[PDB]
Design a protein around this nucleic acid. Structure first.
Lengths: 22, 149, 141, 129, 99, 26
RNA sequence: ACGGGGAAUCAGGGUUCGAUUCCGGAGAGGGAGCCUGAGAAACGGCUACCACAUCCAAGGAAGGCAGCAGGCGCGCAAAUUACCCACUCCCGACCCGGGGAGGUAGUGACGAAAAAUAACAAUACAGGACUCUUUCGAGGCCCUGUAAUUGGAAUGAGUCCACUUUAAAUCCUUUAACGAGGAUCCAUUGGAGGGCAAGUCUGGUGCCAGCAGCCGCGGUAAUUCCAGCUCCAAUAGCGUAUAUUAAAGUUGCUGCAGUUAAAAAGCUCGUAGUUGGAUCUCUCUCGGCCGAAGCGUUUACUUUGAAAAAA
RNA sequence: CGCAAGACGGACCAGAGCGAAAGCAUUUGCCAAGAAUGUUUUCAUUAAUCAAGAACGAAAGUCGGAGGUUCGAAGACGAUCAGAUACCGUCGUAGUUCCGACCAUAAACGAUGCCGACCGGCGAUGCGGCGGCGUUAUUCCCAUGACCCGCCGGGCAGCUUCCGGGAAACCAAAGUCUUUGGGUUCCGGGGGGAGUAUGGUUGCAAAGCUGAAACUUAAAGGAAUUGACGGAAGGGCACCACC
């Protein structure tokens, strides 16, 4: 996997987690 | 190299080996002292005084004719400036840069250069304070600087 | 480069002390997380109760069923998988008996084909597996 | 900037000796440099040298005899007692049959053998062999 | 590993070089990295020159030329055979082909 | 003697490879 | 994490350990407060509370093994409810009493030291070679091995007396008696592909069972499982797990790296920090061949001297 | 043939210059800087690198204001395709532009910290200075410009070399390293988990800085070599290829 797309997935995961923990 | 630039310039004065008054120079030590006194009364700094003594009077080095340096001569006579010449010129340059920056506020290069000039000013002031040339309470400010100029 | 000055002892010692934490062995042996996560709690052996017999499949290049046992340690109630070393030695073990279990020799690392198994059975029912294996001793009745 | 003018001098001598040159220019000179060079000369490692006097700091033209393997400085100038001299000799010298560790002691600048003879420690300036 | 000492460009002594658009694909390529061709060709072909010169109302009118500057990107310059791959030793050669 | 040399050249990377290479001299 | 003396390892530098018999501290289930006394905030003294717990006729009374043994519990993990004040010392009013301090035995493969399990001759056998002709052969003239060959010599393990030991004792030492030819009075623990010393011998199994720290071996001829034989490694010891030291110049002070293998901050400024060019060659007094009060600005450094618990 | 708007400064333009880096290209003026060279001027150690702290920091992105030509995330269609939520095409929103406030990240690269010394050669080039045949312009003299031939000093680089180094690729630095010590900052310790969780801090947000562990694994990886392969290029051959 391209490293920048792994970074993008991690950032989307972090955003989803931020929505999880408000 | 340079303190605040990547340059590694080598240009500088290369003094001759001999420490003696040159043969062509007929001026006595007291005559050179009187010329220095007149030039200082005219309002010229030791650098300028030495320049015009070298360039028009044949005085290669005032130290080798008088036995004393020009700034020391002026201090002994008592007509030396309150703050040293290099520090005064640094403060003048900083004041000029600050006055430019007030009417040109988008000049980030001017801000960078002002930071460099003020760092040089602070280094010179710290040195002169350790040597007791400046009072220990002397500090450089962004408002009273133009008063000292 | 490194600082070579007569008054750089503090800086050198501090740099060494910070950089030691980037050594895996030093950080493992000086943090406490590894000690607290160690099922044996820092011991060399531990006694446990066999909960079941399991057959762990060897890693991909090899093909075999390694006979292991799920044992719950008496010291902390933690469940681990302990390899039963020799052949026919799983027959010496019965359910809910006490086994003395040691490490597998690699200090918390899996050994050989057996994946995720870091413990081996040394004794079963207070009799060594090697004494039962060679017929020197028989299972207590 | 330039620090440890002795380090620069010894580096110049070493690099000139590696190149096979018969002479090397060392600048600036110093009392420590001259004393180190004299200690080098008494053991026959560099031969004669000349101090050019310019009216700010000296220069030294050192004739090079190709007997020098390595001349080095020890920075910082660790203070060495007579007990630690053997350890320093083992660390820095190629053999016990030759090679000298130069120390500055209260009796002057001299090799380690002369320091043992005078029964004094000091601060290690460098080595040559 | 490094294929070229100059990294396939001429960006020595600066930090940024303005980009240009490839004449073929319109790709953004640094001006010092793009392969530059200056083609000075007769505005009429060598076939049409005879008819055009015969039909000219002037005598020795000399047809004008056409001065085109082409800035190929590396992919397009390789595909168009304007430059080609070279051996590791021959890569260093910088004299233009004699033509 | 040359038996090890010869059986080694049959299978340079076989099962009997480290053994025979060591048996040559070690 | 009680500290140190110190211990393990160590080319040099270092790394780790030090609960543990010596010194110092702390505590006596946890806190706290006291009496007495020279000395205690004492616990084999008292007073409470907190926790736990004993006897009770239920009204009350009595507790403190981190002393020596011994239990329980915990665990991977550690010995006798023995004898004695004979030694060493301590205490007392005391030459006389007492001391689980301490000593002595018991258990003890924690470890450390010494050290058996055979030695020697003849018999021939596989036997060699500076023995000799002429390589061919004679081979007690220079040494190993077949040994279910032979032969006597030696001796301690053991059993048992008598001393000796010691406070009775035991042990060691000493003496005598018996005590060795499968000297069956019978050495083991791991291995035999490489690392790493020692078999591609035989039988079994057939990617199974298993082995294997690592690499790998095993799918019908397995040098690697399971066995037999043989072989080698240490040896009364050897394997295993964990921790740790060296290996590790893979923590680099000595002494590592940072273009691409892991890695120089995007870039300057900047305080602390670290580092910093040349240069400078021992005097007023006192008891006439002396002696000194010193301030020569000091510091680092180096050398010497003193003082510094044994183990 | 005009007019309006916004964007951008081709060719000249270079292994050329300047800037700390990001970055910087129409003319002219103003403003404040700056390196290098020249200096028989002045001070006289005032210096190097730097925790803390601070300035600047492509693009994208975020708030307001202006503008809004082109291009264009998203989006709407049209194609291609087995399918295309893409590549190609027509439109097209944010954005792209300027002003103010944020953000502080890039393969922000020379993947190479800064200061200092030493160590080969050569030809170029930029700036300054010095010296000199000769040509050309200011109608003619010197000065000065443009050339020519050298030298010196810093600078962007290049070629060459058995300097030396390195695993090599390669590097006159990545050399002067077991013959190991010039000064100083940052930073790495097998591969993953993971630049993740968590706490802290910064931000309006997006996110930035700091930043693990459990667990897992015998290899990941660097340089080079030989093959094989290529919807890479160039050559050569053959009526089981063609003309």
């Amino acid at each position: 996997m391209r490293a920048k797309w792994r970074k993008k997935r991690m950032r989307r995961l972090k955003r989803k987690r931020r929505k999880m923990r408000q | 190299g340079r303190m605040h630039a990547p340059g590694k310039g080598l240009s500088q004065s290369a003094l001759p080996y001999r420490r003696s008054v040159p043969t062509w120079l007929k001026l006595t030590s007291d005559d050179v002292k009187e010329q220095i006194y007149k030039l200082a009364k005219k309002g010229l700094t030791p650098s300028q005084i030495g320049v015009i003594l070298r360039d028009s009077h044949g005085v290669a080095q005032v130290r080798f004719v008088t036995g004393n340096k020009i700034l020391r001569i002026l201090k002994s006579k008592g007509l030396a400036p309150d703050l040293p010449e290099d520090l005064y010129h640094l403060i003048k340059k900083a004041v000029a840069v600050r006055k430019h920056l007030e009417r040109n506020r988008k000049d980030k290069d001017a801000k960078f250069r002002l930071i460099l000039i003020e760092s040089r000013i602070h280094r010179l002031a710290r040195y002169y304070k350790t040597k007791r040339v400046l009072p220990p309470n002397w500090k450089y400010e962004s408002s009273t600087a133009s008063a000292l100029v | 480069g490194k600082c070579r000055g007569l008054r750089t002892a503090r800086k050198l010692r501090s740099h060494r002390r910070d950089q030691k934490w980037h050594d895996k062995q030093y950080k493992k042996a000086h943090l406490g997380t590894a000690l607290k996560a160690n099922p044996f709690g820092g011991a060399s052996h531990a006694k446990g109760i066999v909960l079941e017999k399991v057959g762990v499949e060897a890693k991909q290049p090899n093909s075999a069923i390694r006979k292991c046992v799920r044992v719950q340690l008496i010291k902390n109630g933690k469940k681990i998988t302990a390899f039963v070393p020799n052949d026919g030695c799983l027959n010496f073990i019965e359910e809910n008996d006490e086994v003395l279990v040691a490490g597998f020799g690699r200090k918390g690392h899996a050994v050989g084909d057996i994946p995720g198994v870091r413990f081996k059975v040394v004794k079963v029912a207070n009799v060594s597996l090697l004494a039962l294996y060679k017929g020197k001793k028989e299972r207590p009745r | 900037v330039r620090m440890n003018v002795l380090a620069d001098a010894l580096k110049s001598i070493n690099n000139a000796e590696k190149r096979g040159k018969r002479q090397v220019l060392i600048r600036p000179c110093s009392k420590v440099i001259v004393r180190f060079l004299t200690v080098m000369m008494k053991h026959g490692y560099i031969g004669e040298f000349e101090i050019i006097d310019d009216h700010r700091a000296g220069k030294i033209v050192v004739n090079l005899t190709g007997r020098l393997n390595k001349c080095g400085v020890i920075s910082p100038r660790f203070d060495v007692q007579l007990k630690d001299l053997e350890k320093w000799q083992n660390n820095l010298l190629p053999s016990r049959q030759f090679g000298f560790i130069v120390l500055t002691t209260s009796a002057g600048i001299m090799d380690h053998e002369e320091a043992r003879r005078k029964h004094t420690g000091g601060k290690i300036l460098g080595f040559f062999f | 590993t490094k294929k070229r000492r100059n990294n396939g460009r001429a960006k020595k002594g600066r930090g940024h070089v303005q980009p240009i658009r490839c004449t073929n694909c319109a790709r953004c390529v640094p001006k010092d990295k793009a392969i530059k061709k200056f083609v000075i060709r007769n505005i009429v072909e060598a076939a049409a020159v005879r008819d055009i010169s015969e039909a000219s109302v002037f005598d020795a009118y000399v047809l004008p030329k056409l001065y085109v500057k082409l800035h190929y990107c590396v992919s397009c310059v390789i595909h168009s055979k304007v430059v080609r791959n070279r051996s590791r030793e021959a890569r260093k050669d910088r004299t233009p082909p004699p033509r | 003697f040359s038996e090890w040399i010869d059986d080694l050249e049959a299978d340079p990377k076989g099962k009997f490879a480290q053994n025979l290479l060591k048996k040559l001299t070690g």
